């Protein structure tokens, strides 16, 4: 109960919320049904509209008006935003030439440039170019400030997950807002767009920017505006707050627009009805900038213009129906639409089997427009699994499509023409970023980047220490004129051993054989040098990776490759090699077909063994450095060492072999040499982080050889591809992947065909950031380059998406 009998007089849009049954006058009261009786009258004034006119100039103040055109309004801070334009001969901000803002130009009493975050719902990245003629305020922000061609949202590309990632720097799996709809089985409670449960604080994890600021003594305006407060009032309230005394004035502010998303759902991303919403958004930005200019704040405030996600063409007829695949359709609950999440309708049903649901949904129609996954098999780049609110079964839906449970759900619940929610690499889901102000750069374009990075930057802009988050702090330093964050490289925790020859062949009883006893001071001194690391400068281009946890490992040198070999996991953590443009591919000779050779630098006790593989009828093996790319017939013997071997399902070897035999040489051709680092990943609890030894759920039968959940590779070359990978003077170019190590190829519906028809498509789906691989391995790459550390942090956050041009 709210006894709504108090007054909002002198209290309108109060920053500090009061505890009911005291009524409330803050911009959330409407959402809680708790406003005082006079809230509309006093706080939502609309009399005379939003703009000064020639006849209103110099008027006698009338407190009933929405905004004012009287002489006293500027000091009072409540003029209509076009006041000085209409009455004092001033130009609109959009009509002024832009001029570099080298330093903040702020009124006395400002301790730091304020930050204003203007967020737009459903603002697709291509609107900046395509709508440019009708958005001149936005175009000026964009061209005069710092801008990216687009900003990558998080998955799912829905509103709440993305706005909360913007606020926290966290993946949805960590912040807890994993969709627009959710069931939490621990609370046994549901979260929905409509309703009140979404306001309960138990949904919202991490630490959002407004709490980070408050806790560190920086005051914050509101971020969540009640839908019924018009845009013009939100702007005037921000302008009013900026006129408060120094000790009361917030330093951070947010404005939110429900558009263009609201219209885009009805008309599609490029419907002719979309012009007007973009015009209206531009006019609101114009009102803010004119307002800031009136207050002499337009060269003081940092402004961010940012979207949550884009918008795609989606109509009712493009719906797949689970009732077409499942007979048991009423025994499941589907969270539907641009993604699917399935769980049992009833937990008392012991006949419910996710395995048989997956099988009934796998590759059943020729052009099937969704693909089923256990959540732990989703591409690791989506970071969408480590939350009890994410159902074990997930459906990834093709762009332009919907999934629903039954046809009745679609015509009993065509209206819409746009929607979003799809895979976050999809071009139509991409959104916008512009920063404009003293702290951003002038007329600068920066590469595309992920929205998880912005929290850190907003903290930098406000001089705040960010809470622990998934951004990589420093990776966006190139956006900023000053206030950069200067990170140091993490300290290596374990130093390596460098073993020499310490074991005789006969000490190994591994059940391994090799036709290798087919036997000179030229090339015996030579092979000794190679084993001591004579070629290491060629294969380890950026220094050895640092191991950031306590463990026992050895560096192993060879003619063609270098590895860091784990005595705990019995295989390399990483294997590094360079393949020049001119390198040649050879085959595994017949005499070496099943050859595995003991490594005399490494004890039998710390070695894999061939008998385990023989005995394990499911598990085979592959090699991290490919025998196909050996530099000479003699060097090829190194690739068959037991220390270069890793466990692989036969289904996975089809993938791995095509990558190693065909694709590495192809990339070396296209890129002028590549350096490759490959290795295993163990993530049995799907939390995106390196497993400890006691977390491993599967071993090669009868042995202590742990089975990787994934295999990675990081492929680096010179950004200027006129220089070879091993002789690069400037910036680097990277692409990486984290391939799931699966015992079938059910994921790929075309896998009965030749690897050339399906493997590359699989790898593209499992594209990754070096940073993703770091989390997953506890390794730190690129320790020794001639490049700045911030540039390397940007490189580590890069994602090769394989999409066409935006
Ligand atoms: C992205 O960035 C984020 C932020 O850096 C990373 O997430 C962090 O990962 C850490 C490692 O997993 C994790 O550290 C653990 O924290 C536990 C205490 O956590 C509470 O307090 C913090 C701090 O205020 C708070 O943020 C947490 O909030 C979580 O939980 C609430 C719900 O209760 C949610 O509202 C919120 O959204 C968030 O949930 C998310 O994280 C949890 C895991 O914490 C997941 O379960 C959820 O799915 C969701 O993703 C908490 O309120 C602490 O207890 C842990 O300590 C145990 O494990 C360590 C290992 O070192 C061990 O030493 C300890 O002894 C202890 O073990 C004992 O307890 C075990 C478990 O009960 C038990 O099995 C053992 O037997 C032992 O007795 C641990 O230190 C940190 O909480 C999260 N933070 C956040 C915000 O998510 C994330 O890794 C990054 N992602 C990537 C890919 O890099
Ligand atoms: C820059 C940022 N803007 C916002 C804006 C936000 O909310 C904006 C908002 N106001 N009214 C409404 O319906 N929405 C969605 C939120 C809340 C959803 C959490 C976080 C952030 S972080
Ligand atoms: Ca893990
Ligand atoms: Cl959802
Ligand atoms: K086997
Ligand atoms: Na298949
Ligand atoms: Zn929407």
From Swiss-Prot:
Organism (species): Rattus norvegicus (Rat)
Cofactor list: Zn(2+); Ca(2+)
Residues that, per the record, bind Zn(2+) 2: 261, 265, 420
UniProt: 1-hexadecanoyl-sn-glycero-3-phosphate binding residues: 159, 180, 261, 420
Span list, region Required for secretion: 773-794
Cofactor note: Binds 2 Zn(2+) ions per subunit. Binds 1 Ca(2+) ion per subunit.
Tissue expression pattern: Abundantly expressed in cerebrum and cerebellum. Localized in secretory epithelial cells in the brain and the eye including choroid plexus epithelial cells, ciliary epithelial cells, iris pigment epithelial cells, and retinal pigment cells.
Primary localization: secreted
Top EC class of this enzyme: hydrolase
Coiled coil start-end: none
Residues noted as binding Zn(2+) 1 in the record, renumbered to the chain: 121, 159, 308-309
Domain SMB per the UniProt entry, residue ranges: 4-47, 48-92
Name of the featured protein: Autotaxin
Cysteine pairs bridged by disulfides in the record: 8-25, 12-43, 23-36, 29-35, 52-69, 57-87, 67-80, 73-79, 98-144, 106-300, 316-414, 363-749, 512-610, 514-595, 718-728
UniProt binding sites for 1-tetradecanoyl-sn-glycerol 3-phosphate: 159, 180, 261, 420
EC number: 3.1.4.39, 3.1.4.4
Catalytic residues identified in the record: 159
